[PDB]
Amino acid sequence: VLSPADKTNVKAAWGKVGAHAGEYGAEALERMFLSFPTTKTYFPHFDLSHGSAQVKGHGKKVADALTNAVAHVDDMPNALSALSDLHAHKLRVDPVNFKLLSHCLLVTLAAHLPAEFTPAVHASLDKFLASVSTVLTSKYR
Amino acid sequence: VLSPADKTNVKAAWGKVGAHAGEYGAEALERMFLSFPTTKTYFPHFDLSHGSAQVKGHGKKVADALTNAVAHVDDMPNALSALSDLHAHKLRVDPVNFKLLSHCLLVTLAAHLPAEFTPAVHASLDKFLASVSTVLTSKYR
Amino acid sequence: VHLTPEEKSAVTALWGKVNVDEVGGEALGRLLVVYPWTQRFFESFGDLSTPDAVMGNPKVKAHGKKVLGAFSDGLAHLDNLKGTFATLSELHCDKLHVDPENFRLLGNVLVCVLAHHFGKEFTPPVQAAYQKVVAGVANALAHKYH
Amino acid sequence: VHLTPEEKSAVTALWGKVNVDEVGGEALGRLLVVYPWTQRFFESFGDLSTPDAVMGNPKVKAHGKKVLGAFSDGLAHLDNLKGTFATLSELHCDKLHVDPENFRLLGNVLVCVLAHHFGKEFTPPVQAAYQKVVAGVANALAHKYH
Numbered sequence A, B: 001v002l003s004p005a006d007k008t009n010v011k012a013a014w015g016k017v018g019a020h021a022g023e024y025g026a027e028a029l030e031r032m033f034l035s036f037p038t039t040k041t042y043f044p045h046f047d048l049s050h051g052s053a054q055v056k057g058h059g060k061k062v063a064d065a066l067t068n069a070v071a072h073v074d075d076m077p078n079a080l081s082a083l084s085d086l087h088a089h090k091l092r093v094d095p096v097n098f099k100l101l102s103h104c105l106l107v108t109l110a111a112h113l114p115a116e117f118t119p120a121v122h123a124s125l126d127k128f129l130a131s132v133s134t135v136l137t138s139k140y141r
Numbered sequence C, D: 001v002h003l004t005p006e007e008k009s010a011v012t013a014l015w016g017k018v019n020v021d022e023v024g025g026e027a028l029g030r031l032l033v034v035y036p037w038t039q040r041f042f043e044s045f046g047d048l049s050t051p052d053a054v055m056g057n058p059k060v061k062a063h064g065k066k067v068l069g070a071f072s073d074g075l076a077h078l079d080n081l082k083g084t085f086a087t088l089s090e091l092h093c094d095k096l097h098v099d100p101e102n103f104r105l106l107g108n109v110l111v112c113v114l115a116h117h118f119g120k121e122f123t124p125p126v127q128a129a130y131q132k133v134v135a136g137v138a139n140a141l142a143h144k145y146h
């Protein structure tokens, strides 16, 4: 459950990301492919080379979806509805993988937000990423 | 989300458990301690030997909680509120462990309900134990 | 893997009574029913729409038999699971693109099926020995991933 | 662990820039803040009432220095972690009753701390190398559990 304080922390941190959201999105994916190579099994159709347009483009789509969820943090289920269906019925990514991407997004934010990444914000972002992951896997079965 | 068929399946299987629920709860714990030894770290104060009355006593408490959950399958958060508080604020069992007990409860049910443990029922029971686990860990942070 | 003599004999003794064809079909069918996202690897298998459809699908039963037969082979080489499964590990990574988490789910479904099939004979200590084996097998199959 | 020569040098090179006592206190405090259930072992430490109280607690900081100092010494034995941590593994299981999942949580929190401390220097490849190390240490610490 995100407390009001959590929502405030997320909004503040994400706000700082600002215009770099897609570039951060791309970096988090590269960090995941390198650290957790089993996640590559879901991208056999992609050029996974560093800076590939496919990864940059996907990074942007992931960032925008996170922006959408931050914007509608009080109603995530409705906000990510479409994405929830896609992942449940077409992509069918094992739920374990969401935890790995979340970790890599946290590391990316840490690496880029020296001032904002306090212990309390880190806690709030971790919870937020867990919630998004839960909404995305909620229609699996 | 537990569909009406899931709810039906769970009430039917648990129905058949009936009077043996306590015995099956103890058996599930025993299976868990032998199969996943790290779970023993939460019960340094118990005699974990086969036939231990402490395990049997604890098995009964667990099974009774599950019976109460089945009874209130539409209002689980409120029915399990005191248990969610207990686990979050005192026992503080790592969330990973809930998956291990759930699996051992499924194995116990399989071993005792040959006829009732159909693939459809197995799927409903797995969803149900995941929902119970989510409720029990909902107040951790 | 590291099995005590008692765990080895428990494993071996039960496996002599397993009809691999039958258990294989049941295990794979239950995986597809209980964790439906796993169906993503079997688009060409036909109808997997209902539990009944999945369970009586002949391509499911056939594949199930192949998988458990290979699994049976590793029971014969418990001391060298990685070496036994290396080729299949590379196949599943490079050609099939199967997330190894699927090996773990199958391991758990298999345990459930043995318990369902054998009842009371599938005691806590026997299960514990099987849990070490399925974890070993999953680890052996994920070994060559990169 | 199996790190290529490149990976080892990357790990060693960043580590040389680390203030062990400082990062230790930070990593342990952040574990207790981000995953509050981990506070269960630390009731004798006093006030863990807020993030500020945790981060500022001298007992937390002292335990963090002790934990990371051990970690640090392990970095010298990348090739023999299981051996290096065997006694500590036993202690953590038999006397302390620490669920090894806690070792995994600490490893992820440590990576986030390094990322926060080093910024752009903590590149994707340096992260990958550190991931292997924290998983290797967690595994080595969980090895003697029974």
Ligand code: HEM
Pocket (backbone or CB within 6 Å): A039, A042, A043, A058, A061, A062, A065, A066, A083, A086, A087, A091, A093, A097, A098, A099, A101, A102, A132, A133, A136
């Ligand atoms: C925070 C969690 C995640 C978010 C917000 C997210 C979001 C998205 C979005 C916005 C798309 C594109 C949808 C479209 O084009 O219509 C997508 C597609 C995709 N996602 Fe997810 N995703 C997440 C986690 C994951 C994970 C963990 C994996 C696998 C490891 C994954 C694998 C995929 C794949 C394979 C596609 C299709 C790529 C393509 O073919 O273009 N996603 N996701």
Ligand code: HEM
Pocket (backbone or CB within 6 Å): B039, B042, B043, B058, B061, B062, B065, B066, B083, B086, B087, B091, B093, B097, B098, B099, B101, B132, B133, B136
């Ligand atoms: C479906 C999941 C679970 C249910 C329904 C459940 C239910 C309960 C109940 C009813 C109690 C007794 C509360 C009281 O004393 O009034 C309890 C206590 C306890 N539970 Fe949970 N539990 C679950 C999972 C777990 C797991 C996975 C673990 C650890 C591996 C765990 C560890 C404990 C411990 C250590 C106690 C205190 C035992 C004592 O000292 O008497 N629980 N639980």
Ligand code: HEM
Pocket (backbone or CB within 6 Å): C038, C041, C042, C063, C066, C067, C068, C070, C071, C088, C092, C096, C098, C102, C103, C106, C137, C141
């Ligand atoms: C105990 C674990 C497993 C073993 C020993 C195993 C073994 C095998 C073997 C022997 C083959 C046949 C290769 C050939 O002759 O072409 C195969 C193919 C295959 N396996 Fe695995 N398997 C295992 C688990 C899994 C799991 C869990 C999945 C996915 C849910 C999976 C997906 C596949 C697929 C999609 C194929 C190709 C079938 C086709 O040709 O269309 N396997 N496996």
Ligand code: HEM
Pocket (backbone or CB within 6 Å): D038, D041, D042, D066, D067, D068, D070, D071, D088, D091, D092, D096, D098, D102, D103, D106, D137, D141
């Ligand atoms: C890199 C991982 C870790 C390493 C290298 C490590 C190392 C150590 C060392 C060197 C000690 C002192 C042993 C002695 O008294 O001789 C210790 C004690 C202890 N550790 Fe661990 N530890 C790690 C992770 C953890 C985690 C994650 C927790 C709990 C969340 C934990 C809980 C404890 C406790 C409660 C003690 C006893 C403290 C005392 O009696 O003051 N450790 N650890």
